[PDB]
Amino acid sequence: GPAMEALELELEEVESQIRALVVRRSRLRERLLAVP
Amino acid sequence: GPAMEALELELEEVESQIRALVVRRSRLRERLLAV
């Protein structure tokens, strides 16, 4: 129903935002290893 | 040096954001599994 659909959408959003932050974290860690 | 210090700060910021989003993910999953 509507309530489940709303929650499922919110879950998809949060998962996508986490994936993006994790890519950023990996990139920043790579950089950290590239400076003095 | 300063470049490492800057990257370490950004890494702290990103981690805090991830941790908060992971808690939300858990809460939402819980609700759906409570159906």
Author numbering:
A (entry chain A): 12 to 47
B (entry chain B): 12 to 46
Task: Quote the study that presented this structure, word for word.
Instead of Gag, non-LTR retrotransposons frequently encode a distinct multidomain protein named ORF1p, which is translated from the first open reading frame (ORF1). To learn whether the esterase domain is more than a mere molecular fossil and to learn about the potential functions of esterase-encoding ORF1ps in non-LTR retrotransposition, we took a structure-based approach and characterized the ORF1p of the ZfL2-1 non-LTR retrotransposon from zebrafish, Danio rerio. We defined the boundaries of two functional domains and determined their crystal structures. We also demonstrate that the esterase is enzymatically active and binds to negatively charged liposomes. Together, these findings define a third class of ORF1p architecture and suggest that lipids may play a role in non-LTR retrotransposition.
The first structure is that of an N-terminal coiled coil domain that we show to cause a dimerization of the molecule, an assembly mode that is clearly distinct from the trimers formed by the LINE-1 ORF1p. In analytical SEC, the N-terminal construct indeed shows self-interaction and we find it to exclusively form dimers, whereas the esterase domain remains monomeric at concentrations up to 75 µM. A proteolytically stable fragment of the N-terminal construct gave crystals that contained two copies of an antiparallel homodimeric coiled coil per asymmetric unit, and the structure was refined to an Rfree of 21.5% at 1.55 Å resolution. Each α-helix comprises five heptad repeats, confining the coiled coil to the region between M15 and P47 as we would predict from the sequence. Because of the charge compensation between the highly acidic N-terminal heptads and the highly basic C-terminal heptads, we presume a preference for the antiparallel orientation also in the absence of crystal packing constraints, an arrangement that is clearly distinct from the parallel trimeric coiled coil formed by the LINE-1 ORF1p. Whereas coiled coil domains and their ability to multimerize are hence frequently present among ORF1ps, the resulting assemblies can differ significantly in terms of structure and likely do not always have a common evolutionary origin.
